[PDB]
Amino acid sequence: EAALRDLDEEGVVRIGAEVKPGDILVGRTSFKGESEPTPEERLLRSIFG
Amino acid sequence: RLVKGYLEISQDGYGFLTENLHNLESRVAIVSAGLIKQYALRAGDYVVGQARPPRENERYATLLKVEAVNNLDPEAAKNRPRFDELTPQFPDRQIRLETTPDELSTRVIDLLAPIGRGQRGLIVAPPKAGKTTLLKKIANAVLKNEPDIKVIVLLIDERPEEVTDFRESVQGAEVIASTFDEPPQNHIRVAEFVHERAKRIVEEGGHVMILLDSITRLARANNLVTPPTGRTLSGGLDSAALYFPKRFLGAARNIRGGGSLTILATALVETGSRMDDVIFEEFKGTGNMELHLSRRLEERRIFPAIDILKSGTRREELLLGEEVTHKMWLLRKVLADMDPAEAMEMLLARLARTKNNKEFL
Amino acid sequence: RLVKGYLEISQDGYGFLTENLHNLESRVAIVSAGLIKQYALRAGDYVVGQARPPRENERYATLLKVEAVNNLDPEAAKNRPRFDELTPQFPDRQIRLETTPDELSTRVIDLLAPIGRGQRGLIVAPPKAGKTTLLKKIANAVLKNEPDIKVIVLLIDERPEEVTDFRESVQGAEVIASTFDEPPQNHIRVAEFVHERAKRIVEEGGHVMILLDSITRLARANNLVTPPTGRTLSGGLDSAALYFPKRFLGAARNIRGGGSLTILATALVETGSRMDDVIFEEFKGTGNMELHLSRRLEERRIFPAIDILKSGTRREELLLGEEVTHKMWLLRKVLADMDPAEAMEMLLARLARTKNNKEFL
Ligand SMILES: Nc1ncnc2c1ncn2[C@@H]1O[C@H](COP(=O)(O)OP(=O)(O)O)[C@@H](O)[C@H]1O
Ligand SMILES: Nc1ncnc2c1ncn2[C@@H]1O[C@H](COP(=O)(O)OP(=O)(O)O)[C@@H](O)[C@H]1O
Numbered sequence: 001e002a003a004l005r006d007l008d009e010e011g012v013v014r015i016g017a018e019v020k021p022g023d024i025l026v027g028r029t030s031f032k033g034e035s036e037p038t039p040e041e042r043l044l045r046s047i048f049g
Numbered sequence: 050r051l052v053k054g055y056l057e058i059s060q061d062g063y064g065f066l067t068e069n070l071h072n073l074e075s076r077v078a079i080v081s082a083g084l085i086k087q088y089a090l091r092a093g094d095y096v097v098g099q100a101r102p103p104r105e106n107e108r109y110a111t112l113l114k115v116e117a118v119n120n121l122d123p124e125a126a127k128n129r130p131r132f133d134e135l136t137p138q139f140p141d142r143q144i145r146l147e148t149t150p151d152e153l154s155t156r157v158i159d160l161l162a163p164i165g166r167g168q169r170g171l172i173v174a175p176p177k178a179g180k181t182t183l184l185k186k187i188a189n190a191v192l193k194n195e196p197d198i199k200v201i202v203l204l205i206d207e208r209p210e211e212v213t214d215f216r217e218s219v220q221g222a223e224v225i226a227s228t229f230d231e232p233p234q235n236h237i238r239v240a241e242f243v244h245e246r247a248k249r250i251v252e253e254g255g256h257v258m259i260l261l262d263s264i265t266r267l268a269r270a271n272n273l274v275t276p277p278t279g280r281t282l283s284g285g286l287d288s289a290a291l292y293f294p295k296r297f298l299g300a301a302r303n304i305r306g307g308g309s310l311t312i313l314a315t316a317l318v319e320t321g322s323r324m325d326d327v328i329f330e331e332f333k334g335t336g337n338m339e340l341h342l343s344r345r346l347e348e349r350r351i352f353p354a355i356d357i358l359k360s361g362t363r364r365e366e367l368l369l370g371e372e373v374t375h376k377m378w379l380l381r382k383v384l385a386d387m388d389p390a391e392a393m394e395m396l397l398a399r400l401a402r403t404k405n406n407k408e409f410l
Numbered sequence: 411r412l413v414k415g416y417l418e419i420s421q422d423g424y425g426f427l428t429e430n431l432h433n434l435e436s437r438v439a440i441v442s443a444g445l446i447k448q449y450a451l452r453a454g455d456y457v458v459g460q461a462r463p464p465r466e467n468e469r470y471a472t473l474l475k476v477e478a479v480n481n482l483d484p485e486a487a488k489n490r491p492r493f494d495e496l497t498p499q500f501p502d503r504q505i506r507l508e509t510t511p512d513e514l515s516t517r518v519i520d521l522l523a524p525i526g527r528g529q530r531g532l533i534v535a536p537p538k539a540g541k542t543t544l545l546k547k548i549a550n551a552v553l554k555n556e557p558d559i560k561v562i563v564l565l566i567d568e569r570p571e572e573v574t575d576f577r578e579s580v581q582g583a584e585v586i587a588s589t590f591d592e593p594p595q596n597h598i599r600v601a602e603f604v605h606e607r608a609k610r611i612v613e614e615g616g617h618v619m620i621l622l623d624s625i626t627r628l629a630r631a632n633n634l635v636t637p638p639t640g641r642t643l644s645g646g647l648d649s650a651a652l653y654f655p656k657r658f659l660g661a662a663r664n665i666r667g668g669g670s671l672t673i674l675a676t677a678l679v680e681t682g683s684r685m686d687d688v689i690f691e692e693f694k695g696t697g698n699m700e701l702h703l704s705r706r707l708e709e710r711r712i713f714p715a716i717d718i719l720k721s722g723t724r725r726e727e728l729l730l731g732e733e734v735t736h737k738m739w740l741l742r743k744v745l746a747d748m749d750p751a752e753a754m755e756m757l758l759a760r761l762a763r764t765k766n767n768k769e770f771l
């Protein structure tokens with residue numbers, strides 16, 4: 001999240017921002033598990049939100 | 050003289066009144082059986098009555114007449130309901146537990162194991178698990194959140210320095226102790242006197258909180274007092290002995306007619322003793338709440354070191370309204386899964402945020 | 411004619427004076443029951459007195475008058491509180507241990523089991539498992555860091571060559587012994603007689619360090635002592651065998667009124683005997699410290715063969731200052747993780763770098 005400062009809008013990085021190797025360009029999220037996600041992180045987000 | 054002192058009716062129909070040491074002492078006074086028949090009273094009642102100074106060759110003064118019994122007139126003593134005839138219910142007066150001093154552990158206790166009035170639960174752990182420390186924490190929690198209720202703590206067969214630390218740190222609450230130094234007959238005498246007095250207080254429609262220390266080593270104390278076992282229940286239990294723990298334990302109940310009797314106590318488990326396992330199994334089917342405690346979590350110094358999955362309550366609805374019932378239902382459908390150790394650290398982190406209601410909110 | 415030594419009141423109402431041989435000697439002097447009453451004396455007190463030689467047909471010297479008791483006049487001895495009501499606290503006076511011969515072992519001890527005056531500690535491991543010479547090391551370190559404390563060592567049920575060896579190698583400090591060759595009765599006599607002298611010695615506000623060899627080998631030797639003592643527990647134990655060992659060990663305590671009584675003893679565990687293991691847990695609920703030693707370490711000749719993970723103190727803050735308690739708080743949050751064998755070598759290296767405080771420095 002600290003390096004997320006260059007990722008301004010929803011997923012796409014802001015124009016005119018310099019990038020180094022190893023820096024996020026587009027933030028894409030897949031599903032945690034193919035058939036069942038991690039119960040740890042699932043229940044994490046369940047009781048936070 | 051004001052006589053704060055409870056009937057220890059001896060074998061021959063005369064009685065004794067122990068002192069603030071909560072054990073047989075000097076200020077015992079004879080309680081004749083004629084007064085027992087006259088007043089229709091039960092032993093252990095708070096009796097005040099005129100006493101004459103002892104005379105030559107006369108050892109224990111005779112009670113001339115009870116003026117105020119239980120701070121009440123004799124006729125109330127003559128005509129008052131019998132305890133065993135009272136209707137037991139499920140606990141309906143839940144006990145809220147929010148603590149600033151340890152928000153984490155006590156808030157885990159609350160959100161996981163809610164407590165009601167009349168509750169008969171059992172928290173269990175192996176030896177050297179600070180079960181006494183948890184007793185201290187919950188005692189302070191009750192003294193803070195519910196000061197109205199009478200809090201009483203009984204300690205059996207334990208270290209004296211811990212007793213002193215508790216009594217200094219309990220801030221005047223009724224703390225009864227019987228160290229392992231004391232011979233076991235003293236242990237059982239004190240335990241049963243507390244039992245009868247508490248029965249009287251509940252019989253007077255009170256909210257009586259009894260915090261018993263370590264029912265399992267208390268059971269060993271009984272076995273040390275109780276010779277035969279009859280036939281050896283594996284390793285030396287006893288049927289008729291444990292009945293006194295059984296009577297002392299199952300007496301806790303929610304009474305529909307006012308007042309309540311909630312007693313909570315802890316068990317020693319995983320001691321390599323089949324006896325301890327048998328007592329745990331035997332009272333497990335008796336109590337409506339259980340709070341298991343994993344040793345290796347205490348090894349990790351993580352407090353509370355609860356075995357959460359084994360822990361649970363009966364009649365979750367009867368302490369929690371249908372909206373709270375269903376929200377707890379959802380929360381159990383949620384939390385019934387995630388792994389114990391990580392559960393303990395990351396739940397510690399997540400409940401470190403805010404108040405229990407605030408955390409839920 | 412001056413008679414000197416420790417008072418051993420015989421059961422027949424008269425007494426004896428035992429000498430440095432630390433057993434039943436013939437240098438005994440009679441203290442009748444009437445003498446006991448009128449001086450209110452206890453056995454074991456450091457007695458210096460005048461006596462007369464035994465008469466015709468009479469075999470043991472008879473006391474004439476008492477002059478010195480525990481290096482004090484008898485008149486003050488009549489006026490002194492007895493041990494039982496003495497207010498105990500938790501240990502408050504720790505002992506720094508960096509010894510030039512083996513600073514590593516003492517450093518591990520300080521980091522894992524800080525030692526304070528009045529501590530009831532323990533070390534647990536099977537037979538032939540790293541105990542006695544470690545006891546030697548800690549005794550020697552105490553002989554330098556706290557020369558003021560009267561340090562006493564008791565050996566029960568061990569090989570005479572070890573007895574002699576530690577005898578010269580302790581540098582004259584108080585070493586008591588009772589080999590397994592000896593009958594159990596001598597074991598009991600010596601053990602309880604040391605117990606009671608230590609009771610009186612701490613009774614004078616003294617700090618007493620008791621280095622008991624083999625607490626659970628003492629337990630096994632007591633089972634051999636145990637003629638019946640009650641009903642068969644699991645593993646072959648009976649009911650009341652423990653009480654004399656329990657009254658023996660639980661006497662360890664930190665007293666508010668000055669002095670201390672710190673007893674460290676070595677426990678044998680994992681012997682494949684239900685008896686031995688059950689004694690391990692039941693005395694585990696008695697001590698304020700245990701030091702585990704696993705055998706995979708020692709079969710590798712890894713020393714000190716300490717199971718670091720299982721070891722831990724009670725109430726660090728009560729013995730260790732808030733800054734010190736906080737720094738060990740952080741450190742235990744740090745040192746809890748690393749895995750046993752790799753833990754052994756990396757922690758050994760880390761403490762081999764510099765001294766404990768120097769490591770913090
Ligand atoms: N929740 C806790 N908070 C603080 N200390 C604890 C806790 N649980 C266990 N301990 C530690 O465990 C040690 C021994 O357990 P203790 O609580 O005294 O025995 P019991 O098994 O009777 O509860 C105590 O010195 C205490 O420091
Ligand atoms: N600090 C140590 N380092 C290396 N070896 C030790 C240490 N302490 C004890 N030992 C060895 O371990 C053995 C255990 O001593 P002892 O307590 O008499 O045996 P046990 O308790 O197993 O019957 C001793 O013979 C000694 O040689």
Ligand code: BEF
Pocket residue numbers: 333334335
């Ligand atoms: F005691 Be169980 F609920 F049958």
Ligand SMILES: [Mg+2]
Pocket residue numbers: 179180181182
């Ligand atoms: Mg305890």
Ligand SMILES: [Mg+2]
Pocket residue numbers: 538539540541542
């Ligand atoms: Mg050895």
